[PDB]
């Protein structure tokens, strides 16, 4: 007649929502999210840590996978985030309600999370989710230790202002494995140049490529597995084709330079 449009739900490919059983990455580190969204459980003798949770509706699944690992609601001490978008921080508020988990995040991720991803720099209110409060604010290079796994925050602003790569050392076969869980280094449909909401976007992405390429990185994981050539459905070969941090960063930078060119053209 004509009415305003209905609200549109943030709808995603089915594989993003497909449950999987825990997939072991190293002695204490498991993928427990879906086939196409990363949620890392790190289990220690002094509690559990979750890095990302995926979409809002994944909370019960994650909890089931935690129980399958021996991790009870009280055992979950800490939630860490790559970035505070709906598709990776979605279930955080619910998890905080159903577990003993406390969130540690940088100021940028905390503010975005506290607004449930509303007023996004690029997407406006198209990707909102339940808001949650951070319990601890972390600085660049700050370390959080849980049961002798030491997580180091490496800011890598761009994809979001508060994007973070979290690094830690696990073991396999008695040998150290230096794991890097790096955020996306894409800029999907973003205005890169002269963006009033993010004036130094380009400078930040460039620094973030250099940050990521230099990470301690025997194994790279990304919030979307595909971005690092992981295949979570491939069992014993899941991680076989995984990129190095160096390769992941080079690819991201070459794509960004091509995106700049297209933006100037468009």
Domain tally, the chain: 1
Catalytic residue among 28, 36, 52, 88: 88
* Method of structure determination: X-ray
By residue count, the chain amounts to: 266
Residues 6+ apart with CB under 8 A from 98: 59, 63, 73
154 is an active site residue: no
Catalytic residue among 190, 198, 205, 248: 190
Q: CA-to-CA distance for 87 and 224, rounded, in angstroms?
A: 10
87 is an active site residue: yes
Tokens for 235, please give them.
């069992």
Strand partners, 48: 43, 76
Catalytic residue among 28, 61, 85, 154: 85
200 is an active site residue: no
Give me the resolution in angstroms, 1 decimal: 2.0
Tokens for 41, please give them.
């459980």
Closest CA to 220 of 164, 172, 181, 185: 181
190 is an active site residue: yes
198 is an active site residue: no
> Which residue do the tokens 């700050």 mark?
142
Degrees, nearest 5: CA angle 251-255-259: 170
Q: Where are the beta strands (DSSP E) in the chain?
A: 23-26, 29-31, 40-44, 47-51, 76-80, 102-105, 136-137, 143-146, 149-155, 164-172, 175-181, 219-221
28 is an active site residue: no
Q: Is 184 left (phi over 0), alpha (psi -120 to 50) or beta?
A: beta
Strand partners, 219: 179
Give CA separation, 178 vs 25, 151, 208, 219, in Å.
11, 11, 19, 6
Residues 6+ apart with CB under 8 A from 38: 31, 51, 52, 54, 88, 181, 221, 222, 223, 224, 225
* CATH code for the domain in which residue 50 is found: 3.60.15.10
Give CA separation, 9 vs 15, 32, 126, 159, in Å.
17, 24, 8, 22
Using CB atoms within 10 A of its CB, is residue 231 exposed (0-12), middle (13-18) or buried (19+)?
middle
Q: CA-to-CA distance for 82 and 89, rounded, in angstroms?
A: 8
Using CB atoms within 10 A of its CB, is residue 258 exposed (0-12), middle (13-18) or buried (19+)?
exposed
224 is an active site residue: yes
**Contact between residue 216 and residue 180 where contact means Cβ atoms under 8 Å apart:** yes
**How many separate helices (H) and strands (E) can be counted in the chain?**
6, 12
Give the annotated binding-site residues for substrate.
183
Catalytic residue among 28, 61, 154, 159: 159
**Contact between residue 91 and residue 66 where contact means Cβ atoms under 8 Å apart:** no
Give CA separation, 13 vs 40, 120, 231, in Å.
20, 22, 16
Q: CA-to-CA distance for 199 and 238, rounded, in angstroms?
A: 39
Q: Is 164 helix (H, G, I), strand (E, B) or coil?
A: strand
- The whole domain housing 42 covers 1-266
Degrees, nearest 5: CA angle 95-85-20: 55
């Amino acid at each position: 007649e004509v009415p305003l449009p209905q609200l549109r739900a943030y709808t995603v490919d089915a594989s993003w929502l497909q449950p999987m059983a825990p997939l072991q990455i190293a002695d204490h580190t498991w993928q427990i999210g879906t086939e196409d969204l990363t949620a890392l459980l790190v289990q220690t003798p002094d509690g559990a840590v979750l890095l990302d949770g995926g979409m809002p509706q994944m909370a019960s699944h994650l909890l089931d996978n935690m129980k399958a690992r021996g991790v009870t609601p009280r055992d979950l001490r800490l939630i860490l985030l790559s970035h505070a978008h709906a598709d990776h921080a979605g279930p955080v508020a619910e998890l905080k309600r159903r577990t003993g988990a406390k969130v540690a995040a940088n100021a940028e991720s905390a503010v975005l999370l506290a607004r449930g991803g509303s007023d996004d720099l690029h997407f406006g209110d198209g990707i909102t989710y339940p808001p949650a409060n951070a319990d601890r604010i972390v600085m660049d290079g700050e370390v959080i230790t849980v049961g002798g796994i030491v997580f180091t925050a490496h800011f890598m602003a761009g994809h979001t202002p508060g994007s973070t790569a979290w690094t830690w050392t696990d073991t396999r076969n008695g040998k150290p494995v230096r794991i890097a869980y790096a955020d996306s280094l894409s800029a999907p449909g973003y205005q890169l140049q002269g963006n009033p909401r993010y004036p130094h976007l380009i400078e930040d992405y460039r620094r973030s490529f250099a940050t990521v390429r230099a990470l301690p990185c025997d194994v790279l994981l990304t919030p979307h597995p595909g971005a690092s050539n992981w295949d979570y459905a491939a069992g014993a070969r899941a991680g076989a084709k995984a990129l190095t941090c160096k390769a992941y960063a080079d690819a991201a930078e070459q794509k960004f330079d091509g995106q700049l060119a297209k933006e100037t053209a468009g």
